[PDB]
Design a protein around this ligand. Structure first.
Ligand SMILES: CC(=O)N[C@@H](Cc1ccccc1)C(=O)O
Ligand SMILES: CC(=O)N[C@@H](Cc1ccccc1)C(=O)O
Ligand SMILES: CC(=O)N[C@@H](Cc1ccccc1)C(=O)O
Ligand SMILES: CC(=O)N[C@@H](Cc1ccccc1)C(=O)O
Ligand SMILES: CC(=O)N[C@@H](Cc1ccccc1)C(=O)O
Ligand SMILES: CC(=O)N[C@@H](Cc1ccccc1)C(=O)O
Ligand SMILES: CC(=O)N[C@@H](Cc1ccccc1)C(=O)O
Ligand SMILES: CC(=O)N[C@@H](Cc1ccccc1)C(=O)O
Ligand SMILES: [Mg+2]
Ligand SMILES: [Mg+2]
Ligand SMILES: [Mg+2]
Ligand SMILES: [Mg+2]
Lengths: 367, 367, 368, 367
């Protein structure tokens, strides 16, 4: 595969409802899409960065910059190229995992389309559909939360994840437990908002039987998570900290984690994500698929990834309409709490050009 | 892919020279080959069992029996089949890894041929050729060893591995070191022939600067290998003990291993072998590709596997003519101490039917 | 003595009731018997393999094959043989523990009959009878389970062991506890059906005061069992994982086990079983005797084994009639919840030839 | 067996040469023999106590007393008796292991004679002869030591063990090494004579390549031995400390021992000794057979014991004439450095009544 060039698009899509997290609130999703062009044809990738460096150090303008002036040129200068070779070709560049991952996705989609092979087949899928949960944001009042939660249970979502932060943890959890009972699969996610000094407050979650607490402490504090685990009954899950398969292995060896959230972009691609899955499986650590409010492109890849054998807890890969009135691909629709795994070549979906154009803010060709 | 049936062949091929190991001597290679037939076309697999249970519990008649009456029927009874799905379809059968691996290889070869994709591309190859060492057997006299070794260094093999056993360890190593010097990459392999009580004898290998000692103790004695490592300077490498990715992770956590030999058949296939590679990479453990004196079918798959990024020590995948005057495939030929990675669809090689018939002792169709 | 030869028999015996486990269901027991012939006399051994490799990698056709073409010829080729020497003579062959154990049993039985000595005396028995529990399979409905359990408590079995699997764990246990109370000795056995990810489901068994959970995870996952132990209150017992005395020592050192199930065939014979017992005793680990639905030959040997001092929990060595209408030997009959330890030479029992012939499906002689 | 009674004999036998140890010197062996009488017939046992409590707390008069007033009556009062049941029948009496062991030996010899079975068969012998070393005492001068050692090497003993103590360690070892070379198997035995404060002195034995140092510290100081092992290169072997299989397991778990000396009387019998062997084997710890200057009765039982599979270092079971001009049984005679394993029923030997009467100093019947 000689790479001819890449099209970078900025896209802006309105959200059905504001999504609030410990780091801020969003009414819109701003993202980067990549169209890799080969002599064979096209492949699509999606960057999971957001507008500013509030979740991790990467952000949309930074990703666009590093892709345009370093990563894409390094691939255009090479002669062969395969999805596997992207990693060594870009290894000299430190970090920028979300950007590398987006690029690897587009290359992989082009490569697999050319062999008429699905993402699911390449990654090692063993099922045709996957059970889906939903991530629910911080709200202004308890009764507004109970409404939203009740709504998603009614749609048939099999698990609820609540965003939490200081001032919004024990009360929402108690309320959800009182209203909906102890059989609902329930977990929480802090996005780094606590310190080890807040252990006694997080220990107040012990009686509610949560599946897990996701990333209570900061990204770099792996040892702190192992300390925290000695003080609370709720199992620790890491997200922000798991930047690679090596990072997962390290965290596991140190007793810092019992369940891992896998997000392809965060780890530098679908291929590294597979390795994270394999490392966790080998240590008996369950994994589940995270979501970065992707369009249908990323959603299609994630649903494929989530059909691997060690994904044994429900993921955040919700139906398109949880986030968007109008997706840019044919949308994902919940059915019996599950999403179906795509079947065509590559991602098994492509942007509907009319819908994509409506939401494109900017476009540039790199050749 | 619906699987139509499988052809089981017994094959017997003479060896250029007797090959002696701590468990016995062979002048011939007896093996099983599989031809998986689909509507799409064919795929080939090779079983790495030997005639009796002297290296592991599996052996040729046992593999033929379990394939024929359990493994193959379970795949024929399934609706849709993929290489990835072979594992869960056969999971209810305990052990029989070499047999399962052979069957998975044939299915994978058929699947990939149909997508016009190489084993190298599927596994994640990052190089076009690989450096090759050679495994050298136990001999009757030191001077006969020095001859053979000198011969293989002359052909351009980049590393020597010596089979060892009680009564044939320190002397052969000292002799090779006195005659060829300290810069030759040199290692040893015991195939389980020692006990922890022999530590003082194995410590006598400390001054010769060996890369490793492969499987000094029995397959089940992982804790003993960790104990042995506290007593000798030579790094421990495991082979027989590494039956899966989980087994590699367990050995590594216990300090029982510093370098891992990967053999696809021993671990239940090329897809598990890839997971062993990934688990070892994530812990910083170098791997290298083993050899089971395969025909060109297995040799092609191994050379592909050995081109993955964490294979950072030379493998035992020697040229065809190290073992055979006449291979059943287009032979592998050493060139600058390297073998080239195959490029066509699937294995990138197939049996030359006239050569295969000369060496086939038996044949049966399962349908 | 020189071994003259060995007779291999395939035997099929119907079960009184279907027996369901996490790995399948059986209405019949298919097994291998061995008759070792020496100048001194005959001895009997029993292989505990089943028809396919669903419990371990070994199975009946595989055991027959490896016995016939490797194990038995290696013993015929030797000069002098004792039960103890069987292990080194067969050491070059990797695995095949059940097959080796069957052959050792037959050689030992012949050796001990010639010295007019019981299995019990050879192994180090300290009691004349042993308390017996029962292993109860998975059923289609909770009320059918309660009926069967109630029946076995009525016969005087001192302990109940329930087979479990995903979808059949917390409910059957709760039901048995509700119907029969908290004083019944109760345990469960998964035969490898769970993963470490199922720890929260297995932790739901915490309030029911089980003695143990046997082999919740796969055979090779010893470190995982140590991890599981830190997450559940029910003590872990290993079965499939304990393939030798070295394996038991390793599991114990890693905190992966608190109680060990000993099955002689699984460990490569009665002599290795004794060593497992002794290693466990030295580390303070209780053991108990497992059952593989053996005929009266294996049952006799197991009852003997179970009379050793560190067998301090009731075993699965149930009475013959729990499994079989007609045993091929003098049957074992429960009495005050106990089975008596056999007293004659060797096993202390032998097949009744007419009963054995009714049930024999194939027979072959292997000699030098 | 109902036990009818036991005959206790005191015996005194002169030694060919004085035997000096860190705890004293002996020119004579004073011991207890037991003759257990059943309806079936007789069996013999031997107590390995010495005259005073200088090696352990047990001694001849103490053993005679405890046997006569506690142990033997407890067995006479029992209804059925087997060698295995001795242990539970005597369990209420604390300690007195050498005494219990002597009684168990006699009962076992009677039981096995009645079944026409050898000690070797009962214990699990896998060889017909065993290699033998010799234990050499402390001497007044270095040149006298070199003579005695040279003599025993000339007879074909395969290993030398030197008794040592403060003032007699480094010099004798150096001298033996300078005279006879580095290939002689050489070890030392301190019988508890050092403290952890003498570690720098014991570290001066590092360069002489000793197989082991036996019981450098006191019986109770198991943790101290583990400390000492961190400070010297010579492997630690325990003798006095290994009072049971449980003790061996404890010592091994604490890193206090690499090699174990088994003495049946010290551990409370041949049946516990077999358990010590099995425990050590399971942990990969080599064992070897000790000697307490027994008569041919004990010697016969020890040679049988030493033929078990994990006895992988030569024992102290020397030929009868190393200690005695005239043994009370048919004597053990070295042959190619080996002693042959007895073959008859029970011990395979019995006292020659005229020789026994010559050396009997006292006799009593307990009935
Ligand atoms: C899509 C986007 O970049 N929004 C916000 C922050 C944000 C994103 C996603 C969820 C919550 C807040 C920003 O950084 O300005
Ligand atoms: C569904 C969700 O909460 N996704 C992110 C939050 C997030 C949304 C959008 C962009 C970045 C982060 C997480 O799992 O933390
Ligand atoms: C042809 C063959 O498999 N021979 C040996 C095995 C063997 C293979 C390779 C090297 C040495 C021995 C046997 O007796 O089973
Ligand atoms: C090339 C070689 O030495 N292979 C095996 C030994 C072996 C050869 C042939 C068949 C089976 C095993 C090893 O790596 O240990
Ligand atoms: C007789 C036999 O081995 N039957 C089952 C297995 C089985 C044995 C014991 C209990 C349940 C199932 C089979 O392999 O099909
Ligand atoms: C009585 C019983 O449950 N035995 C086996 C199951 C089993 C029965 C028969 C043959 C093989 C396995 C166990 O404890 O796992
Ligand atoms: C004869 C005797 O038991 N003498 C010494 C001990 C002894 C035995 C063996 C070797 C040295 C001293 C004593 O107890 O005083
Ligand atoms: C032969 C020898 O050195 N035996 C004892 C010493 C000893 C001899 C005789 C009686 C008691 C102890 C030991 O190994 O420590
Ligand atoms: Mg998070
Ligand atoms: Mg090897
Ligand atoms: Mg079980
Ligand atoms: Mg001593």
């Amino acid at each position: 595969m000689k790479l001819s060039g890449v099209e970078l698009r900025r896209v802006q899509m309105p959200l059905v409802a504001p999504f609030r997290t410990s780091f801020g609130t969003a009414s819109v999703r701003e993202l980067l899409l990549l169209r890799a062009v080969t002599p064979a044809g096209e492949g699509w990738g999606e960057c999971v960065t957001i507008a500013g460096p509030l979740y991790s150090s990467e952000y949309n303008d930074g990703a666009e910059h590093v892709l345009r002036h370093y990563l894409i040129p390094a691939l255009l200068a090479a002669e062969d190229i395969t999805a596997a070779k992207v990693t060594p070709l870009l290894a000299k560049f430190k970090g920028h995992r979300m950007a590398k991952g987006a690029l690897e996705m587009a290359v992989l989609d082009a490569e697999l389309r050319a062999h008429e092979r699905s993402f699911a087949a390449e990654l090692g899928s063993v099922r045709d559909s996957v059970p889906c949960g939903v991530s629910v944001g911080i709200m202004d009042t308890i009764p507004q939360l109970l409404d939203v939660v009740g709504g998603y249970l009614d749609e048939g979502y099999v698990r609820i994840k609540l965003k939490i932060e200081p001032g919004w943890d024990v009360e929402p959890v108690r309320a959800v437990r009182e209203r909906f009972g102890d059989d609902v699969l329930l977990q929480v996610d802090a996005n780094t908002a606590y310190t080890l000094g807040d252990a006694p407050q997080l220990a107040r979650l012990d009686p509610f039987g949560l599946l897990l607490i996701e990333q209570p402490l900061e990204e770099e504090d792996v040892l702190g998570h192992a300390e925290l685990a000695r003080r609370i009954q709720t199992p620790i899950c890491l997200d922000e900290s798991i930047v690679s398969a090596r990072a997962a292995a390290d965290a596991i060896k140190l007793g810092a984690v019992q369940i891992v959230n896998i997000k392809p972009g965060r780890v530098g691609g679908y291929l590294e994500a597979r390795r994270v899955h394999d490392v966790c499986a080998a240590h008996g650590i369950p994994v589940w698929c995270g979501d970065m409010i992707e369009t249908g492109l990323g959603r299609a890849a994630n649903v494929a990834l989530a059909s691997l054998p060690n994904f044994t807890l429900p993921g955040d890969t919700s139906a398109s309409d949880r986030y968007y009135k109008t997706d840019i691909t044919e949308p994902f629709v919940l059915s019996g709490g599950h999403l179906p795994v795509p079947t065509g070549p590559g991602l098994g979906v492509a942007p509907i050009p009319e819908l994509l154009d409506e939401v494109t803010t900017a476009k540039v060709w790199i050749g």
